[PDB]
Structure formats: C-alpha cells, structure tokens
Design a protein around this ligand. Structure first.
Ligand SMILES: CN1CCN(c2ccc(-c3cnc4[nH]c5cnc(C(=O)O)cc5c4c3)cc2)CC1
Length: 264
C-alpha cells in the first residue's frame, strides 16, 4: 500500500500564533489529517515536545517536514472540532457531559505533568473532540518542561490567555507549573457549566474576581452552577497556589465521583 503520505487540502480548521491549521486528505489510504502550516519567514520546540507525547487524551503527532521557509506539522484530525463550540453561550452544557469532558481533561493533564510537561494555555479552543467525543489536548506552542531528571524548575514567563491564567502568574516573579494548569482547568469547567467566563483576569483591579474572593456566589456565573461542582470550583479557584487543590485530590472530589452519565 504505497503513496500513504500524499495529502489533498480541503478546509481551514483554525489559526494559531505561529500559523494556520488545514484539513488534509490522503491519497491511497484515504486518511484525514490536520496539518499546521507556519511561515517561519518556537515551532522547533513545539515539534520537540510533540515527539514526547503519546496518550489517548493528547492530539497525536505524526511528523514534520520543512520546505525552506514553511514548516509543516502533521497531526491527528479531530472531527468533533473544539470544545469551545460545544459550550452554549450563557448556558454551558449538560452537567453529565461537562463531567465526562473534565474527567478526560484531567487524564490528559495528569499524563503531561507526569512526563514533566506543562501546557500553559489550556482553554476550550485548545481542547478538541474526536469522532467519539473523546477530548484531546492540542496546541503545544506555549508548552515547556518543568521537571527534568526528577528536579522541578520554577517558571517565570508570563504567558497563556488572561481569562484562563492563574493569579500568581500576574502577581509573583516565579511560580510552580502544575497549579497554573489546574487553575485553567477550573476556568474551563466554569465555562462548561455556565457558558460564560467569570472574569477578564484574576487581578485585584477586576471586580468580578474581587466578588469571587468575597464569596458572592449569588452572582453569575456561580448562581448557574449546582452546589456539588461549585464546591469543586471553590477548591480549584483558590488564589494561593500552594493551598490550591492538586489533581490527586480533585480525583477524590464528591462531584468528580458523582454517578451522572450512562454509558454508550
Ligand atoms: C464552525 N467550525 C466548526 C469546526 N471547527 C473546527 C474543526 C476542526 C478543528 C481541528 C481538528 N483537528 C485538529 N487537530 C489539531 C492538531 N493541532 C492543532 C493545533 O492548533 O496545534 C489543531 C488541531 C485541530 C483542529 C478545529 C475547529 C471550526 C469552527
């Protein structure tokens, strides 16, 4: 079965910081793939990190090939698109659906953290869905190593997306990598259950963030969220990253372990 690496473009799937992502369809084998096209006239590091990854909740990397100035990355096509488009504005989605996606998100993040990688930009636009609605983490363009030879490195680079970034990234010179990813997962959960982001950024200058710190959960988005997931959010969206809930303890949370959804 030759000619297994000959692709035909069809649709613009999206645009990232470095370039655009297009759907490409194979020749003989009829495989569909996502191809990231960046005009280099950062992606080197993105490719290196992608080569480390192999997990059911991480978008698969197939390979790379450059042509002078234009770098191509070949990646798994997720026909369900972005989680972003499953979130209904001002509504969210059914709690059992949110719970399942959150379970899969945690699985993916545990995997990454276990191999010493932090994503640094978790948000619904970077969480894709395959044909069976399985959630897959994508876009490692801001990802980096925070643990190597069993030694943790503190981060200092401000990066990510403001509504999703943890407060310590705006307040402290250095910070631990893992609690930052945990925080963004909490913002994702909030979005799934409310169809709105709670604040522009987690700063003292942001009224909506002050309200949350004051425990005004009679306001939106919190009043739309049931007491059980809201109790989890209270543990995740903690300002002090050392007091913030860790993933092992998220996995013990009452809502996290609530039977909600029937199998397929
Ligand atoms: C209304 N439209 C519905 C469909 N939609 C959409 C459709 C497909 C994708 C899509 C599918 N597989 C994909 N596989 C990927 C691998 N890496 C990336 C990346 O940004 O790094 C991005 C992708 C990626 C994006 C993303 C969005 C775009 C909005």
């Amino acid at each position: 079965v030759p000619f297994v690496e000959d692709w035909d473009l069809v649709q613009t799937l999206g645009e990232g910081a470095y370039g655009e992502v297009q759907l490409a369809v194979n020749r003989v084998t009829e495989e569909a793939v996502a191809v990231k096209i960046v005009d280099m006239k950062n992606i080197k590091k993105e490719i290196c990190i992608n080569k480390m990854l192999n997990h059911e909740n991480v978008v698969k990397f197939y390979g790379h090939r450059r042509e002078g100035n234009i770098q191509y990355l070949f990646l798994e096509y997720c026909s369900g698109g972005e989680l972003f488009d499953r979130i209904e504005p001002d509504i969210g989605m059914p709690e059992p659906d949110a719970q399942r996606f959150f379970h899969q998100l945690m699985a993916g993040v545990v995997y990454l953290h276990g191999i010493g990688i932090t994503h640094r930009d978790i948000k619904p636009e970077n969480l894709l869905l395959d044909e069976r609605d399985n959630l897959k983490i994508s876009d490692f363009g801001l990802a980096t190593v925070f643990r190597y030879n069993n030694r943790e490195r503190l981060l200092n680079k401000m990066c990510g997306t403001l509504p999703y970034v943890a407060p310590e990234l705006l307040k402290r010179r250095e910070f631990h990598a893992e609690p930052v990813d945990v925080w963004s997962c909490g913002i994702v959960l909030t979005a799934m259950l409310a169809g709105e982001l709670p604040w522009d950024q987690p700063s003292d200058s942001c009224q909506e963030y002050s309200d949350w710190k004051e425990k005004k959960t009679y306001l939106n988005p919190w009043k739309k969220i049931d007491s059980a997931p809201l109790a989890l959010l209270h543990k995740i969206l903690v300002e002090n990253p050392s007091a913030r809930i860790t993933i092992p303890d998220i996995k013990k949370d009452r809502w996290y372990n609530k039977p909600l959804k029937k199998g397929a």
